[PDB]
Amino acid sequence: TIVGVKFNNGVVIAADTRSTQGPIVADKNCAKLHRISPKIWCAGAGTAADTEAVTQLIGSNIELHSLYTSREPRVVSALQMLKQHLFKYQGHIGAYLIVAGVDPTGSHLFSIHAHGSTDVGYYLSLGSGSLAAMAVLESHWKQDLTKEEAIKLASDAIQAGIWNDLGSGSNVDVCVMEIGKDAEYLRNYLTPNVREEKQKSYKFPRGTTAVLKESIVNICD
Amino acid sequence: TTLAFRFQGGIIVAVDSRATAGNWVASQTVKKVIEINPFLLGTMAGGAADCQFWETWLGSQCRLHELREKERISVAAASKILSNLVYQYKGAGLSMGTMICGYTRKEGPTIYYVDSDGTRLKGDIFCVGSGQTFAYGVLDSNYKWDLSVEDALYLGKRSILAAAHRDAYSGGSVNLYHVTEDGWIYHGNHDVGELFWKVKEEEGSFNNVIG
Amino acid sequence: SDPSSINGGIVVAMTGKDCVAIACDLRLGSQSLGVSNKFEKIFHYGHVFLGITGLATDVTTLNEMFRYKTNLYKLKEERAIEPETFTQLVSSSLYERRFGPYFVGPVVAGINSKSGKPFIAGFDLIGCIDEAKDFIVSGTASDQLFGMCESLYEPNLEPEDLFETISQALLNAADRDALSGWGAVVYIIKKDEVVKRYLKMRQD
Amino acid sequence: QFNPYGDNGGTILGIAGEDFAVLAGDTRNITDYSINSRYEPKVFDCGDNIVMSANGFAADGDALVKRFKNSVKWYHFDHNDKKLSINSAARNIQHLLYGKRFFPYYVHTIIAGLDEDGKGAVYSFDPVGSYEREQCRAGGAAASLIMPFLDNQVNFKNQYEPGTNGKVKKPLKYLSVEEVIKLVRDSFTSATERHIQVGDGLEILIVTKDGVRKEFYELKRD
Amino acid sequence: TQQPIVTGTSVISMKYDNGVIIAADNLGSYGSLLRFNGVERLIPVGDNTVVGISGDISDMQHIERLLKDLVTENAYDNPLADAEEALEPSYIFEYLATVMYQRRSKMNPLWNAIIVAGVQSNGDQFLRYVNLLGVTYSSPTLATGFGAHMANPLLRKVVDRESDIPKTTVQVAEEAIVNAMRVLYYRDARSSRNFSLAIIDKNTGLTFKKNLQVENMKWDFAKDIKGYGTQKI
Amino acid sequence: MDIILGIRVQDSVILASSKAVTRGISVLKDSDDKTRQLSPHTLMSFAGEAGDTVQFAEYIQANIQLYSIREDYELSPQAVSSFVRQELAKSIRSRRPYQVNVLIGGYDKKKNKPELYQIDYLGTKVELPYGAHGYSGFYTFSLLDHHYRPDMTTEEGLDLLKLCVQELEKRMPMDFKGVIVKIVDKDGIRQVDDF
Amino acid sequence: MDIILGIRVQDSVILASSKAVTRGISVLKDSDDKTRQLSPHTLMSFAGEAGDTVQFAEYIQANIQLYSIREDYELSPQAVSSFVRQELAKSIRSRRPYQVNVLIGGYDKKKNKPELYQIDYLGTKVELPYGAHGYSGFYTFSLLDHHYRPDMTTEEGLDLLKLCVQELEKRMPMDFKGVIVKIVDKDGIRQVDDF
Amino acid sequence: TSIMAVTFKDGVILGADSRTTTGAYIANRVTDKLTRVHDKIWCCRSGSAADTQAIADIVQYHLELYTSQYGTPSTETAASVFKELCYENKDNLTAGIIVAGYDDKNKGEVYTIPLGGSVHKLPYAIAGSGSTFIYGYCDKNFRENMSKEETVDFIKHSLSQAIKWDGSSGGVIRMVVLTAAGVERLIFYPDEYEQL
Amino acid sequence: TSIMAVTFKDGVILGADSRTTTGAYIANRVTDKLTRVHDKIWCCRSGSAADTQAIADIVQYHLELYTSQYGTPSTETAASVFKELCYENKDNLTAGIIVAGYDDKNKGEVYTIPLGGSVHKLPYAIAGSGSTFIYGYCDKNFRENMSKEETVDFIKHSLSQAIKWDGSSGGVIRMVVLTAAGVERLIFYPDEYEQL
Ligand SMILES: *C(=O)[C@H]1NC[C@@](C)(O)[C@](O)([C@H](CC2CCCCC2)NC(=O)[C@H](Cc2ccc(OC)cc2)NC(=O)[C@H](COCc2ccccc2)NC(=O)CN2CCN(C(=O)OC(C)(C)C)CC2)O[C@@H]1C
Ligand SMILES: *C(=O)[C@H]1NC[C@@](C)(O)[C@](O)([C@H](CC2CCCCC2)NC(=O)[C@H](Cc2ccc(OC)cc2)NC(=O)[C@H](COCc2ccccc2)NC(=O)CN2CCN(C(=O)OC(C)(C)C)CC2)O[C@@H]1C
Ligand SMILES: [Mg+2]
Ligand SMILES: [Mg+2]
Ligand SMILES: [Mg+2]
Ligand SMILES: [Mg+2]
Ligand SMILES: [Mg+2]
C-alpha cells in the first residue's frame, strides 16, 4: 500500500513495511520510501528489485544532472527519465511508483505505471492495498489540507491497507516534503502491529544438537 | 519403496513409512502393509487413498469368500479380485502398485504384483515404488535362494534403508514381515534415524556420507 | 523444469549477542536421486560469509564470480570487503542479469570489522535485498525454516545458545523437505574467531 | 471457464495429550487478498466427544462436516444410540471423502477426541480419504510453517540429551493441557507473523472425558 | 459452465445496534455498456428479510422467482404462516446456500454473489453471504465485487468487531453506507448514481428506500489538473 | 549413449561406458568408445544428445592438448574438471546448449591421488568416490553405497563394476551391448580388453 | 510385451513370444508367458497395452472353452480367428478399446493343415505363412521372405526362428529377455523348454 | 474514453471525458486527455496511455525543433508527424489520436489517426470506446460553421451521451477552444451535463 | 441487424432493417425480422437466424395452445414464454429478442430479452449490432405518449442512422403498427430514409 497527499505548503508520501514472496512475509519491516534526491522521494509497488533498481538509476542520473546544471533537481526530470526508461522496456520492468517532491518550481505529486504512463493528482494510491487506501482518501480528502491533516490522512489511508489488505501489514513509514524546509523521513511513524510476548522460551539446553566435527575457520592471511 | 521376495524360509516383506505431498513430507510413520488375514499380506505404493481404500476393501472380499466357501482365499484369487477391480477403473486415474504375499497349502508361499494398469504377475522378487530401482540394486546383488531367515530379514531391511537414503520420496522407518506355512510374523519398526548410523558403523558401508 | 528445486538445499542465518550464525544442508540431487552428500552451500571472502541455495551450477558459478570480484576489491582498496558493501555487490551483480537471472537464493552473514556490529541479509534471484536483524532463510524448505525460526528465535543469544537454535531450526525444517537434508554444516562467527560444526542428522 | 474450487485460507492444528486432545483453528476466512470474515469458526463439536475441522475450500469443508454430523445422527438411530468411537468416525470420513474421488472435497481434514481407552486421539485425512492416527498434525495454508515446530516441541525430534554425545534421544513424554495450549498459542502467533492468510482470531476446542470446552484468543489483524 | 451477460455490481451491508442495512445500485451492465438503468437488486422476503444480489441478472430473476415461490409454499397448510412459522432470514439463506452449492457441484453455477440481510424472530441481527461457489461467511460488514475492496474498509472503521454493534446507531450506520455508495460511484466503472437501500430494524421493521442518489460529490479540484506531467496550460 | 559409470578406488579411477549406439529401432554399432583421453593421466567419458557428445569431448580434448604443448606440463584433474564445468556452465545459457553429461577420471601426480568428477550438462560438478549419469545411477548408487569400501584395490574395483553391470543387464529395459572399461592410475590410462 | 512371432511350416505352427515385462526403467519379470491355450489344437500369443493383453486373452479363452463344453467339439482355427477378429472389430468402436495384437496358431484336424492368423487391435485379420506384431516385423518379414520355404519340417522351422531371434537380439534397442517357443501340430500344443 | 474535435466559424474545439480505467477500476477520475503539442496544435488521446503519452511527447519535441528552424508548423505537418510514428510502429502501438489545430491562414482543421496510422481530414471527428454510442447522434446534429456556443453545446451533449452509456468514460468534460483570440480551457461537471 | 420497439399513445410500433449477412456477403437483402407469435403479439429477432426462428415457432405454438384453453394471452405471458426458452437453453442459444404486444387493458408494452435470457419491461427497446450507434440518438429524441406519425418518424430516423454506420444493417426499413384499430405493415425504401 503506498499513498501521496498534496497539502498547502508541500506533499506527503506514506507506505506500509511488508515484503511478500507468494503468501509468505519475506520482510516484516522493509523500507518502500526511496530518495531520488534530497527533496524528491519515491514510493514503490510491484517487482521489489525493479522499483529499487529504477529509483537508484534515475537518482544517480539526477545527481549528475544537478551537478552539471548547478541547479536543484526537479520532480518533472525524475518523472520524464523514469517514464522514458520504463516505456523503452515495454512493461517488462515491473515498477509502479508514486513520485513526490519539492523543487524551485513548487510541490509535485505523480504516479508512474510499469508501461510508462504518468498521472497528476492531489491524492494517489498504488499497490494491492490501493483500493482500501483510496476508499479512505475519497472519504476524507479536502482541498487546503494543513501539514498535520495531510500526515493523518496519509497514515489513515495506509492503515486501511494494513488491516483490510493481506498484501500489506506491519508499520507506517512517512516522508514529509515541505516547500522551504528539509524533507523529514519519519521511519516507523506508526507501529500498531507489535508481536505479543510469547508463552514460552524455546531457548534450548546446551548440547541438545548432535555434532560430528568441529574446526576453527581461518578468515586471516 | 516396498519389497517382497521368496527364499528357502518363506517370504520376506519390507516397506518404508513415508507419505509425500509433492516435495512436502506428509508423514514419517505410515503403515504400507495391510494384514488381510493371518496368512495374507498386502503392500501399498502409489495414491495413499487409492491404496488404503481398495486394499481394506480387498480384506472385506477375502472375508466374504471364507464365509461362503468355508476356506481361506488363495493368493491367486485374492490378487485377481484386486487386479479385476482396478482394470474396471482403467483410464480413470487410479494409482496403485501392490504386492499380495501369502501362504496357502495348495499354492505354497506366493507373491503377486498387481498395478493400476491391470498388470498381474506371479514372481519370486518384486520392488515397487519411486525407490524400487535403489531397492533392486542392493537386493538383486546379495539375493540367494538359501538366505537364512535371519540374513533374508536383514537384506530386506538393508534394501529399504538403501532406498530410504538415495530416494528423496522414501524414508522414515522400515517395517518388516516374515511369511511362513504358520502365517505372517511382524519383525518390528526400525527408524532410519538410528538404523542408518548403526548399519554404517557395524557394516562399514555408506562411505559416501560424512561419518 | 523449476530451476530453484532440481538440486534442492537450504541456508539459514541468525544474529546473536556480538555474533552471527549461518548454516546449510549438504544435499545435491537430480530431483528424486540424491547424488552428493558433501555439497556445501556456504563460502567466505575474508570475514564475509555467503550461503547460496538454488540451481547448483549457479551456486558454483556465483561463488567463483564473487571470489573474483572480492579479490580485485582487496587489491585496489587494500582491505577486505565488509558485509554491508558485499551485500550491495551481490545485489548489483544479480540485477545485472535481470532478463536471464541466476536461479539462486543468496544469504550474506558477517561482523563489520570496524563497528563490531553483527550483519545478515538475503536476496531474491534478481537482486532485491531483504535485510533482517533476526534471521534470513532460503531454499526448498524456506516455509519450514520461516516456521522454525519464528518460534525458536529470541534476540541476544550467546554464541553457544545461538548454535542450538539455528541447528534445531535447520535440522527440523530439512526433515519435512524431500529435497533438503543429507547432512548439515553450522558456522558460529564471533569478532575474531569462526567455529565450523558438522551436525549429525537423519540420512533419508 | 468455470472453476468449481477456491481457497479460503486459514490453518488448523490438532495435538493429543494422555487423557485430552486439542483441535485449534484461526477464525480468519479469505479469498485472494480480501478478508471475508475475522471470525468464521471452522472447528466444530460433532457430538460423541469428536471435534472436526475441514480446512481449505470452505464450501467443501462445510459440506463434509454437515455430512459427518448427519452420519453420527444416523449411527445413533440405526445402532441403538451407540457411541461413535474416534476410529469408527475416522473410517466413516474415509468413505465420505473417497465417494468424491473423481471430483474431490478440496480440504485437509483433522478430527480429535478420545480413543476407546480414554487416551488423546488425532486423525488427519488427505482430500480423497487417505488417513492415519498421529500425536499431532497441522493443516491448511501455514501447515508447512507449523508442522516442523510440532515435530520438534511435541515429539522432541532432533533433540538429544545434553552431554550424551548425540547417542541418547530426549525422552518422548505426554504434555499437560497447560503446555499444549502454550505450543498452540505460539504456533499461531508465529504463523500469523509470516503467513498473510493466517490472523484475526484463534479458537481452541479441548476434549476430555468431561466433554468439549472452548478457549478463544485475539491474533494480529494485519 | 456459463459466462455472465447482464450484470449488477456491488451489494454492501452492515449490522447496527437494533438491525441491519443493505444497499445496491439500480444498473444492469452489458460488459462496458451501461444498458439498463431501473434494475432492483434488493428483493424483500416477508417483513424481516432483504436478499441483495450481484452478478448475472438472468440468474438473479430466477432467484426472485424461487423466493416468491418459497413464500407461497410456506403458507400452504400453515395457519401460523404470518406468526411463529413465518420464513426467517436464516431459513431463506440456508435454502439459497443449498441451491448455490448444488448448482456449482453440477458444474452449472448461478453466477451471483448474494447477501441475506434481516432480523430473526428473537430480535437477533442476521447477515450472511453466499456466492456461485457455495462459499458462505458472516461478518459485522459484508460486500460483493468492488464493495469488498472499497466499502468494507470504510464500514469496518465504524464496526470493527462484534462489541462495536451495540454502540452503532442506525443514523451512523446508514451514513457509512451512503458514503460507501458515493466512493463506489467515484471508483467503480460498472456502478451507477441511482441506488436502493433497505433497513431491517427489530422495532420499526422493514424500511425500503428507492430512487436514492449519490450527493455531495467533490469534483472542483479537477479544473486545476493540467496534462500528465510537464504541461502547464 | 545412456550408461557411463566411474569408481575411484585406492590408487586408480575406473570408467565403464556402454558400447551401444542406437537410432530408432536399429542398434547401428555395438563397439562404441564413449571416451577421449584429455591428457596422459586424465580420461573423460560422455553421454547425451547425438552429435553433441563427440563434438564436445573432442573440443575439450583439443584445448587440454594445446595447454599441455604451450606450458610443456599436464593440468591437474581438478583444473581440467573446473575448465570443463565452466565450458558447460557457458553452454547452458547459449543459443543451442551442449546436451552432454561427463565423468572425468584422473590421477593427480602431485598429490598421488585418484580423482573422479561427475559433471552434468548444466555444469553441476561434484567430486565422488563413485558416480553415474542417466538411469544407471538409480541402480548403481545404492548398490555401491552397500559394497564400496574406500581402501579397495584396482582388482576389487573391477569386481565391484561387474556387480554394477550384472545388475544393469538384469533390470535395465534397453540392450546397451556391454561396457568398455578403462583404468586411470599413476602409470596413465589402459583399457581392459575383455569384460 | 513387444515381440511376438509366428511361422507356419509343413505340419506345425511355431509361436515365439518375448519373456520381458517392463514398467519404467525396471524389468519387473524375465519369464512371462504371453500365450493362452484357447483349445487343445489352438494357441493365441498377444502383445499391447498393459492389463488389456491378459484380460482380453483370458476372456477369449473362457468363450472358446465354453463353446467346447457346450458342443463337445473343438472349433476350427479359422472359426476361432473369425470370433477373435469380430471381438476386436467390436472393441475398436467401444468406450475404451482393447489395445491388443494377437497371433493365432492352430492345427485344423479336419483339413490336416497348420494355420497362422495375424490380427491387430483394429480387427485386421490375415492368414500368413509367417507373421509378427510391433517393430519385430521390420526385421523378420524380409529375413523370412529370403529364408522361408513352404515345405520345411518343424526342426527347420525352429532354426528359421533362431535366425529371427539372433537378428532381433543384434539390432533391437530393448532387452526382451529371450523367447518362449510353442509348437502347435496334430498332437496338440507343447513348449520347447530351452531356447 | 470519449474524445472529439469539432471545426466551427472561429476555429476548432477539442472535447474529452476525464476517466481512465484498469478493468472496472477507475485508476484516475480527473485525467487530462487534451494535450498540447504546440501553442495552437492540440490532440485528444485514446488507447494505451503509455503509447499516446510517449507519442505526444515525441511530437512536441519534433514541433519545438521544427519551430526553431522553419517557424510555426501547419496542423497538417503535426498530423503528418503523428501518422509517421503511428504507421511505422503500428505493430507495437495501440494509439487512436485526434489532431486539432488553428493556423491563421487555414483556420480550424481536424485530422483523425485511427489504429492503422491512416490519416483522415474531417470537419469533426469522434473516437474512444464511448464514441460508438454517439455516431448516430453526432451525424444528425453536426452542421458546418457553427458558433462557439453551439459547438460547445454539440460537444457537451455528445460526450454527455457517450459518458451515460460507456462505463469506460465518465468524470468531467474537459474542452480546449482554439481561435485567433488564443487558447481557452473549459471544464463541465457531472451535476451540469448528466441531466441534459 | 437493427431492431427496435416503441410504445406510444395508441399502442406500440416494431421496426427492423431487412439485411442478413454471412460475413461480408448479404445472404438476403429483403429479410422480414418482424415475426407474429399472436394476432397482436409480435417480436423483432436478432442473433442466430436458426435459433430465433426455432424459438419464435415454438412460442407461436405455445400461444396458439394457450388461446385454445384460456383465451388471448397477455404481452407479459408471451415475453415469459420467450424468456423460459432463452434462459433454460442459454448455453446453446444466440438470441436477442424484443417482444411487443397490444392488450386492450394493458395498451402497448415492450419487453427485451438480451443474450442471458433476463427480461426487461421498457417504454422502448433497441437491439442488434446496429443499435450501438443510436443509443445516444434514441435516448435524446424519445418522449413517452408520442403520436403514430411521431413514433414512425422516431423509428425511421433511428434505424436510418443504424443502417448508415452498421455494415450488418441495410435494405428496407420494415415496421408493424399494433393498436386497437388492428395490424398495419409499413415499408420504407433506401431512396427515402438514406437522405433524412
Ligand atoms: C501495498 O500495496 C503493498 N502491497 C504489498 C506488495 C507486496 O504487493 C508490495 O508491492 C511490495 C513492495 C516492495 C517491498 C520491498 C521494497 C520494494 C517494494 N512488493 C513485493 O513485495 C514484491 C511482490 C511481488 C510483486 C510482483 C511480482 O511479480 C513477479 C512478484 C512479487 N516482492 C517481490 O518481488 C519479492 C521480493 O523478495 C524479497 C525477498 C528478500 C530477501 C529474500 C527473499 C525475498 N521477490 C519476488 O517476487 C521474486 N520474484 C522471483 C521471480 N521474478 C521474476 O521476475 O522472475 C524472472 C525469471 C522473470 C526474472 C520476480 C521476482 O508493496 C506494496 C506497496
Ligand atoms: C516407495 O517407493 C515409496 N515412495 C514414497 C511414496 C510417498 O511415493 C509412496 O507411494 C506413498 C505410500 C502411501 C502412503 C500412505 C499409505 C499408503 C501408501 N504414497 C504417497 O504418499 C502418495 C503419493 C502420491 C502418489 C501418487 C499420486 O498420484 C496422484 C499422488 C501422490 N501421497 C498422497 O497421495 C498424498 C497423501 O497425502 C498428502 C496430503 C496431505 C495433506 C494434504 C494434502 C495432501 N495425497 C495426495 O496425493 C492427495 N491427492 C489428492 C488429489 N488427487 C487427485 O488425483 O485429484 C484429482 C483432481 C486429479 C482427481 C490425488 C491425491 O510410498 C511408496 C511405497
Ligand atoms: Mg507498448
Ligand atoms: Mg529420502
Ligand atoms: Mg531430508
Ligand atoms: Mg497476517
Ligand atoms: Mg459512465
Show the domains of chain E with their CATH numbers: 1-233 (3.60.20.10)
Cell numbers for G8, please give them.
507356419
The values of phi and psi at residue E59, to 5°, are: -70, -35
Whats the size of chain C, residue-wise?
A: 204
Return the half-sphere exposure (C-beta side, CA atoms, 13 A cut-off) of residue C125. Answer: 17
What is the Cα–Cα distance from D11 to D140, expressed in whole angstroms? 4
D77-93: buried (b, 16+ CB within 10 Å) or exposed (e) per residue? eeeeeeebbbebbbebb
User: Cβ contact (<8 Å) for F124 and C56?
Assistant: yes
C1-204 folds as Glutamine Phosphoribosylpyrophosphate, subunit 1, domain 1 (3.60.20)
Distances (CA, A) of E47 to E40, E51, E92, E117: 17, 12, 13, 11
Helices and strands in chain D: count of H runs, count of E runs: 4, 12
Largest CA distance in chain F: 48
Atom of ligand 1 nearest to the CA of A31: 16
- In sequence order, the 6+-apart residues with CB closer than 8 A to the CB of I193 are I156, I159, I160, I163, I173
- In sequence order, the 6+-apart residues with CB closer than 8 A to the CB of B110 are B75, B76, B101, B102, B103, B104, B122
Domain that holds residue F59: 1-195
In the three-class reduction of DSSP (H, G, I as helix; E, B as strand; rest coil), residue I175 is classed as strand
Identity of the residue in E2, E36, E60 whose CB atom sits nearest the CB atom of I120? E36
Distances (CA, A) of A76 to A90, A102, F87: 21, 10, 48
What is the Cα–Cα distance from D197 to D10, expressed in whole angstroms? 6
Q: Which of D36, D34, D54 lies closest to E138, judged by CA?
A: D36
With the CA atoms of E95, E97, E99 and E103 taken in that order, what torsion angle do they form, in degrees rounded to the nearest 10?
180
**Contact present, H24 and E190 (Cβ < 8 Å):** yes
Name the burial class of residue H90, with classes exposed (0-12), middle (13-18) and buried (19+) by CB atoms within 10 angstroms of its CB. Answer: middle
Cell numbers for B208, please give them.
559416501
Name the burial class of residue H74, with classes exposed (0-12), middle (13-18) and buried (19+) by CB atoms within 10 angstroms of its CB. Answer: middle
Does residue D128's CB lie within 6 angstroms of at least one atom of ligand 2?
yes
**Residues in a beta bridge with A111:** A98, A119
Query: Taking CA G123 as the corner, what is the angle to CA B121 and CA B115, rounded to the nearest 5 degrees?
Result: 20
| Number of domains into which chain H is organized | 1
Q: What is the CATH number of the domain that holds H7?
A: 3.60.20.10
Taking the CA of C174 as reference, the closest ligand is 5
Ligand 1, residues at Cβ distance < 6 Å: A 1-2, 15-16, 18-21, 26, 30, 32, 44-48, 51-52, 94, 127-130, 161, 167-168; C 101, 122-126, 128, 130
Q: Which of A102, A95, A98 lies closest to A37, judged by CA?
A: A102
Q: Which of A15, C32, E56 lies closest to B23, judged by CA?
A: C32
**Contact present, D84 and D91 (Cβ < 8 Å):** no
Query: Taking CA G149 as the corner, what is the angle to CA G148 and CA G153, rounded to the nearest 5 degrees?
Result: 100
The values of phi and psi at residue B55, to 5°, are: -85, -30
**Contact present, E133 and E158 (Cβ < 8 Å):** no
A164-201: buried (b, 16+ CB within 10 Å) or exposed (e) per residue? bbbbbbbbbbbbbbbeeeebeebeebbeebeeeeeeee
Q: Which of G140, G76, G152, G142 lies closest to G112, judged by CA?
A: G76
Which of the residues F8, F128, F142 would you substitute to probe the B interface, choosing the one with the greatest number of B C-beta atoms within 10 Å?
F142
Q: Which of E56, E62, E53 lies closest to E3, judged by CA?
A: E56
Q: What are the start-end ranges of the H helices in chain F? A: 52-71, 77-91, 137-147, 154-171
**Contact present, H105 and H121 (Cβ < 8 Å):** no
Domain that holds residue H161: 1-196
**Contact present, I17 and I162 (Cβ < 8 Å):** yes
Judged by a CB distance cut-off of 8 A, whether residue E57 touches chain I is yes
Give all strands of the β-sheet with G42-48 in edge-to-edge order. Answer: G35-39, G42-48, G100-108, G113-119, G125-127
How many C-beta atoms lie closer than 10 Å to residue H88's C-beta?
A: 11
The residue whose CA has the least distance to atom 6 of ligand 1 is A167
**Contact present, A76 and A120 (Cβ < 8 Å):** no
Whats the size of chain B, residue-wise?
A: 211
Residue A91 backbone zone (phi > 0: left; psi -120 to 50: alpha; other: beta): left
Query: Taking CA D70 as the corner, what is the angle to CA D68 and CA D71, rounded to the nearest 5 degrees?
Result: 60
What is the Cα–Cα distance from B44 to B32, expressed in whole angstroms? 5
Tell me which DSSP letter residue A155 carries.
H
Name the burial class of residue F40, with classes exposed (0-12), middle (13-18) and buried (19+) by CB atoms within 10 angstroms of its CB. Answer: middle
Taking the CA of B161 as reference, the closest ligand is 4
What is the Cα–Cα distance from B63 to B80, expressed in whole angstroms? 15
Give all strands of the β-sheet with I34-38 in edge-to-edge order. Answer: I34-38, I41-47, I95-103, I107-113, I120-122
Does residue B25's CB lie within 6 angstroms of at least one atom of ligand 2?
no
- In sequence order, the 6+-apart residues with CB closer than 8 A to the CB of F121 are F48, F88, F91, F92, F97, F98, F99, F100, F101
> Which chain B residue lies closest to A213 (C-alpha atoms)?
B211
What is the Cα–Cα distance from F77 to F133, expressed in whole angstroms? 19
Mutational pocket test of ligand 2: of B1, B17, B18, B24, the residue with most ligand atoms within 8 Å of the beta carbon: B18
**Contact present, C66 and C89 (Cβ < 8 Å):** yes
Judged by a CB distance cut-off of 8 A, whether residue C144 touches chain D is yes
Cell numbers for E90, please give them.
436464516
> Which chain G residue lies closest to F1 (C-alpha atoms)?
G173
Cell numbers for D84, please give them.
461413535
The residue whose CA has the least distance to atom 35 of ligand 1 is A21
Does residue B59's CB lie within 6 angstroms of at least one atom of ligand 2?
no
Q: Which of B160, B197, B163, B162 lies closest to B175, judged by CA?
A: B160
Q: Which of G44, G55, G62, G48 lies closest to G104, judged by CA?
A: G44
Mutational pocket test of ligand 2: of B20, B23, B95, B113, the residue with most ligand atoms within 8 Å of the beta carbon: B20
Question: DSSP strand E in chain I: where?
Answer: 3-8, 11-16, 20-22, 25-28, 34-38, 41-47, 95-103, 107-113, 120-122, 124-127, 173-179, 182-188
- In sequence order, the 6+-apart residues with CB closer than 8 A to the CB of H28 are A119, A121, H18, H19, H20
CB atoms within 5 A of ion ligand 4 belong to B 168, 171; C 204
**Contact present, A176 and A151 (Cβ < 8 Å):** yes
CA E143 to chain centroid, in Å, comes to 7
User: Cβ contact (<8 Å) for F126 and C35?
Assistant: yes
- Whether chains I and H touch (3+ CB pairs under 8 A) is answered by yes
AA identity, residue F76? S
Residue carrying C-alpha cell 510353442? G182
Q: Which of G78, G87, G14, G13 lies closest to G57, judged by CA?
A: G87
Cell numbers for D118, please give them.
480414554
What is the Cα–Cα distance from G138 to G147, expressed in whole angstroms? 15
Residue carrying C-alpha cell 468416525? D89
**Contact present, C26 and C183 (Cβ < 8 Å):** yes
Distances (CA, A) of H107 to H75, H100, H120, H125: 10, 11, 17, 16
Q: E strand or H helix at C63, and its extent?
A: helix C56-77
What is the Cα–Cα distance from F3 to F1, expressed in whole angstroms? 6
Separation of CA C178 and ligand 4 centre (Å): 6
Map out the domains of chain C as residue ranges: 1-204
What is the Cα–Cα distance from F2 to B13, expressed in whole angstroms? 32
Name the burial class of residue G93, with classes exposed (0-12), middle (13-18) and buried (19+) by CB atoms within 10 angstroms of its CB. Answer: exposed
What is the Cα–Cα distance from E119 to E49, expressed in whole angstroms? 7
Name the burial class of residue G151, with classes exposed (0-12), middle (13-18) and buried (19+) by CB atoms within 10 angstroms of its CB. Answer: exposed
Query: Taking CA E10 as the corner, what is the angle to CA E9 and CA E12, rounded to the nearest 5 degrees?
Result: 160
Q: What are the start-end ranges of the H helices in I40-147? A: 49-70, 75-88, 135-141
User: Cβ contact (<8 Å) for A138 and E156?
Assistant: no
Cell numbers for A131, please give them.
483500493
The values of phi and psi at residue G19, to 5°, are: -95, -10
The residue whose CA has the least distance to atom 42 of ligand 1 is C123
- Whether chains D and G touch (3+ CB pairs under 8 A) is answered by no
Give all strands of the β-sheet with D11-16 in edge-to-edge order. Answer: D136-140, D11-16, D21-26, D201-208, D211-218
**Contact present, F136 and B194 (Cβ < 8 Å):** no
Q: E strand or H helix at H68, and its extent?
A: helix H49-70
Residue carrying C-alpha cell 480414554? D118
Bind-site residues of B for bortezomib: 48
- To the nearest whole Å, the CA of C174 is away from the closest chain F CA by 21
Q: What are the start-end ranges of the H helices in chain A? A: 48-69, 75-88, 130-140, 147-164
| Number of domains into which chain D is organized | 1
AA identity, residue H114? P
Tell me which DSSP letter residue E158 carries.
T
CA E128 to chain centroid, in Å, comes to 10
Q: What are the start-end ranges of the H helices in A89-221? A: 130-140, 147-164
Return the half-sphere exposure (C-beta side, CA atoms, 13 A cut-off) of residue H16. Answer: 25
Does residue B18's CB lie within 6 angstroms of at least one atom of ligand 2?
yes
Q: What are the start-end ranges of the H helices in B37-148? A: 48-68, 75-88, 132-140
Taking the CA of C173 as reference, the closest ligand is 5
Q: At what angle do helices E170-187 and A130-140 cross, to 10 degrees?
A: 110
User: Cβ contact (<8 Å) for G52 and B121?
Assistant: no
Helices and strands in chain C: count of H runs, count of E runs: 4, 12
User: Cβ contact (<8 Å) for F173 and G169?
Assistant: no
AA identity, residue A31? A
Query: Taking CA C134 as the corner, what is the angle to CA C131 and CA C135, rounded to the nearest 5 degrees?
Result: 75
Q: What is the CATH number of the domain that holds G18?
A: 3.60.20.10
Transcribe F14-47 into DSSP letters.
EEEEE--EE-SS-EEES----EEEEETTEEEEEE
In the three-class reduction of DSSP (H, G, I as helix; E, B as strand; rest coil), residue I173 is classed as strand
The values of phi and psi at residue H65, to 5°, are: -75, -35
**Contact present, B99 and B139 (Cβ < 8 Å):** no
Transcribe B1-17 into DSSP letters.
-EEEEEETTEEEEEE--
What is the Cα–Cα distance from E105 to F68, expressed in whole angstroms? 73
| Number of domains into which chain G is organized | 1
- In sequence order, the 6+-apart residues with CB closer than 8 A to the CB of C151 are A202, D149, D153, D186, D187, D190
What is the Cα–Cα distance from I189 to I176, expressed in whole angstroms? 15
Q: Could you tell me the sign of the dihedral formed by the alpha carbons of E34, E38, E43, E47, in that order? A: positive
How many C-beta atoms lie closer than 10 Å to residue D157's C-beta?
A: 21
Residue carrying C-alpha cell 560424512? B210
- In sequence order, the 6+-apart residues with CB closer than 8 A to the CB of I109 are I7, I12, I75, I76, I100, I101, I102, I103, I121
Residue E125 backbone zone (phi > 0: left; psi -120 to 50: alpha; other: beta): beta
What is the Cα–Cα distance from I76 to I66, expressed in whole angstroms? 13
Does residue B77's CB lie within 6 angstroms of at least one atom of ligand 2?
no
Method: X-ray
- In sequence order, the 6+-apart residues with CB closer than 8 A to the CB of F6 are F13, F14, F15, F16, F45, F103, F105, F116, F118, F128, F130, F131, F132
Cell numbers for H15, please give them.
472535447
- In sequence order, the 6+-apart residues with CB closer than 8 A to the CB of B108 are none
User: Cβ contact (<8 Å) for B93 and D144?
Assistant: no
Name the burial class of residue D105, with classes exposed (0-12), middle (13-18) and buried (19+) by CB atoms within 10 angstroms of its CB. Answer: buried
The residue whose CA has the least distance to atom 47 of ligand 2 is B21
- To the nearest whole Å, the CA of I138 is away from the closest chain E CA by 13
- To the nearest whole Å, the CA of F1 is away from the closest chain C CA by 19
What is the Cα–Cα distance from D135 to D119, expressed in whole angstroms? 11
Cell numbers for H26, please give them.
477507475
In the three-class reduction of DSSP (H, G, I as helix; E, B as strand; rest coil), residue I75 is classed as helix
Q: Which of D163, F25, D9, H167 lies closest to E193, judged by CA?
A: H167
The values of phi and psi at residue E14, to 5°, are: -160, 160
- To the nearest whole Å, the CA of A170 is away from the closest chain D CA by 7
Q: Which chains touch I (3 or more CB pairs under 8 A)?
A: E, H
